[PDB]
Design a binder for this molecule. Structure first.
Ligand SMILES: Nc1ccn([C@H]2C[C@H](O)[C@@H](COP(=O)(O)NP(=O)(O)OP(=O)(O)O)O2)c(=O)n1
Ligand SMILES: [Mg+2]
Ligand SMILES: [Mg+2]
Length: 424
DNA sequence: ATGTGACGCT
DNA sequence: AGCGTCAA
């Protein structure tokens, strides 16, 4: 069993927030530029970076003042602020544009604001019947790389050489061949990406493979504005020098313990271990997942879900801005509640659903965790004053200050999240 | 002083 | 229900 039953694609917009700002402001197009939030602390935090600016070393999570040292001509678009908070509505609305287009071709799993997985298995079957044994020509794959080819001068010439080798070895006599299915999947993803660019102006990259992990890895191989086919046969060479941390979900603690417990570096080294061995170190599910994954096999389905299942709104209060008075906490809980309410009302009108749970999270000064404490409470009315009052009720117990007006220990984050949606 | 969404574990 | 991880 080779895990070649499905055709899965991962479409990811290139430097998404930048492209959103570049569409709106033509003077930013074809320039080193980045998107920044809050200009007051070190010129603001960089949150997205055009490929021209990336060539100078500018990255996400950099302060704009430091980015300017690397790239003095860097152009910056600023995130909208509302009620004292960075507001991401323009990017969420642009996300909805691209997802609705992708949804025309197949069912999609929203994986982030700027990417979706798509199960193309059925669409490939139908497209194979319309083709009626007719070969696939290179003109149908004008931006596709075949990973690991060519084998046996300039960028575009080698892409074509690899594509030509792939298409000349293709056995179209068989409508069940997985390589043919992947190839037809890639013809559809070219049309998908052309529709996105035509109808939004936004460019994106894609990976095409047999499962989600390989599709996502494939997408990043030839960014920007290109797509990549990772076939089952290409996995052994691909994985033989692929660091473990590059595989989705292995970029943190679990991947680091794989490396340390097993004494290995690359994904292909995992194949020498039995399934039971991997389960002993990493548990039954992780072990089974690793045993199949290092062979290019994974079964996680593309879930039919185009909409987020939580709706969240948070604000950081770093260092000396931390909230230390009762009245401060109440004012910022109401600012957040008002943003959440307008987001929730729009969600109900657009998507015919209502959240029923409100989760209230806070961070306390001196805690290195994301959240210091989470408490849930009922969400009955999209009313910001009631939501903020309710949110305060369930956290006022955390004020350990003897004086009534002060708040201690001081709060470095407030986080409101509406969840548990039901039809409406 | 980086600044919200999906999921597994218990 | 409350927490931790990974990321996007
Ligand atoms: N930590 C992060 C990751 C992403 N984002 C936002 C900004 C991104 O433009 C957008 C999509 O994230 P992304 O796909 O990981 N990278 P981006 O689309 O900017 O560039 P590519 O590397 O995908 O071409 O989500 C963020 O604000 N904070
Ligand atoms: Mg992207
Ligand atoms: Mg992305």
């Amino acid at each position: 069993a080779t895990g070649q039953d499905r055709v899965v694609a991962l479409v990811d917009m290139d430097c998404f927030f930048v492209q959103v700002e570049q569409r709106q402001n033509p003077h930013l197009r074809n320039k080193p530029c980045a998107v920044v939030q809050y200009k007051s602390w070190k010129g603001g935090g960089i949150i997205a970076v055009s490929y021209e600016a990336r060539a100078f070393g500018v990255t996400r999570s950099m302060w704009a003042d430091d980015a300017k040292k690397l790239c003095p001509d860097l152009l910056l678009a600023q995130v909208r602020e509302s009620r004292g908070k960075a507001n991401l509505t323009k990017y969420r609305e642009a996300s909805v544009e691209v997802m609705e287009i992708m949804s025309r071709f197949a069912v999609i799993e929203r994986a982030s604001i700027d990417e979706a997985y798509v199960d193309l298995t059925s669409a490939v079957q139908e497209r194979l019947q319309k083709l009626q044994g007719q070969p696939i020509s290179a003109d149908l794959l004008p931006s596709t790389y075949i990973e690991g080819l060519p084998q046996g001068v300039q960028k575009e010439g080698m892409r074509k050489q690899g594509l030509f080798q792939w298409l000349d070895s293709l056995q179209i006599d068989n409508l069940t061949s997985p390589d043919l299915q992947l190839t037809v999947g890639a013809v559809i993803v070219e049309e998908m990406r052309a529709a996105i660019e035509r109808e939004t102006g936004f460019q994106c990259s894609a990976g095409i493979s047999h499962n989600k992990v390989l599709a996502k890895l494939a997408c990043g191989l030839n960014k920007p504005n290109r797509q990549t086919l990772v076939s089952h046969g290409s996995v052994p060479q691909l994985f033989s020098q692929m660091p473990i941390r590059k595989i989705r979900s292995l970029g943190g603690k679990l991947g680091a313990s794989v490396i340390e417990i097993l004494g290995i570096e690359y994904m292909g080294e995992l194949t020498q271990f039995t399934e039971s061995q991997l389960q002993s170190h990493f548990g039954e599910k992780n072990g089974s997942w690793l045993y199949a994954m290092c062979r290019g096999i994974e079964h996680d389905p593309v879930k039919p879900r185009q909409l987020p299942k939580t709706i969240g709104c948070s604000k950081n209060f770093p260092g000396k801005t931390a909230l230390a008075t009762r009245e401060q906490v109440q004012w910022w809980l109401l600012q957040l509640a008002q943003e959440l309410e307008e987001r929730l009302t729009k969600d109900r009108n657009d998507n015919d659903r209502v959240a029923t749970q409100l989760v209230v999270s806070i961070r306390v000064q001196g805690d290195k965790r994301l959240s210091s404490l989470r408490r849930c409470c009922a969400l009955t009315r999209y009313d910001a004053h009631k939501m903020s009052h309710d949110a305060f009720t369930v956290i006022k117990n955390c004020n350990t200050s003897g004086i009534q007006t002060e708040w201690s220990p001081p709060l470095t984050m407030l986080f409101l999240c509406a969840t548990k949606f039901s039809a409406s």
